[PDB]
Design an enzyme around this catalytic site. Structure first.
Site, PDB file in Angstrom:
ATOM      1  N   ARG A   9       0.609  -1.187  -0.016  1.00 54.05           N
ATOM      2  CA  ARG A   9       0.048   0.066  -0.091  1.00 54.05           C
ATOM      3  C   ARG A   9       0.722   1.341  -0.109  1.00 54.05           C
ATOM      4  NH1 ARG A   9      -3.365  -1.136   5.212  1.00 54.05           N
ATOM      5  NH2 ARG A   9      -1.578  -2.067   5.457  1.00 54.05           N
ATOM      6  N   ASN A  65      -6.367  -2.664   1.997  1.00 59.89           N
ATOM      7  CA  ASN A  65      -6.374  -4.127   2.405  1.00 59.89           C
ATOM      8  C   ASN A  65      -7.779  -4.718   2.338  1.00 59.89           C
ATOM      9  OD1 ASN A  65      -3.462  -4.551   2.504  1.00 59.89           O
ATOM     10  ND2 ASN A  65      -3.638  -4.683   4.807  1.00 59.89           N
TER      11      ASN A  65
HETATM   12 CL   LIG Z   1       1.520  -1.809   3.181  1.00 59.75          CL
END
Ligand SMILES: [Cl-]
Ligand SMILES: [Cl-]
Ligand SMILES: [Cl-]
Ligand code: NA
Length: 90
Positions: free
Chosen positions: A19, A37
């Site tokens: 991310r 996520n």
């Molecule tokens: Cl991450």
């Protein structure tokens, strides 16, 4: 040429700095939205900005950082909605 991009990323993509990798490249490119996520181990990206910027971001997403192993990316493009002020991770 403003657009919205959706991507979902499969593989070894959680717990490997994925991310933060998406974020840094989004910031470099002027792109807003998020990398999220998901509960099945995959990652969702919702990104807005100029279509060519988004395309560059997609190139990066398909690779991920060195620690990742991207197996598959499903993606699509739709109308820009102007919903974000920055690029976040969660
Ligand atoms: Cl991450
Ligand atoms: Cl934007
Ligand atoms: Cl949409
Ligand atoms: Na998918």
């Amino acid at each position: 040429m403003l657009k919205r991009m959706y991507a979902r990323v499969y593989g070894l993509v959680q717990g490997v700095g994925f991310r933060k990798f998406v974020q840094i490249h989004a910031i470099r490119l002027g792109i807003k939205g998020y990398a999220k996520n998901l509960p099945d181990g995959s990652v969702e990206v919702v990104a807005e900005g100029y279509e060519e910027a988004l395309s560059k971001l997609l190139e990066r997403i398909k690779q991920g950082p060195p620690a990742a192993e991207v197996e598959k990316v499903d993606y699509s493009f739709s109308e820009y909605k102007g919903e974000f002020e920055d690029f976040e991770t969660y």
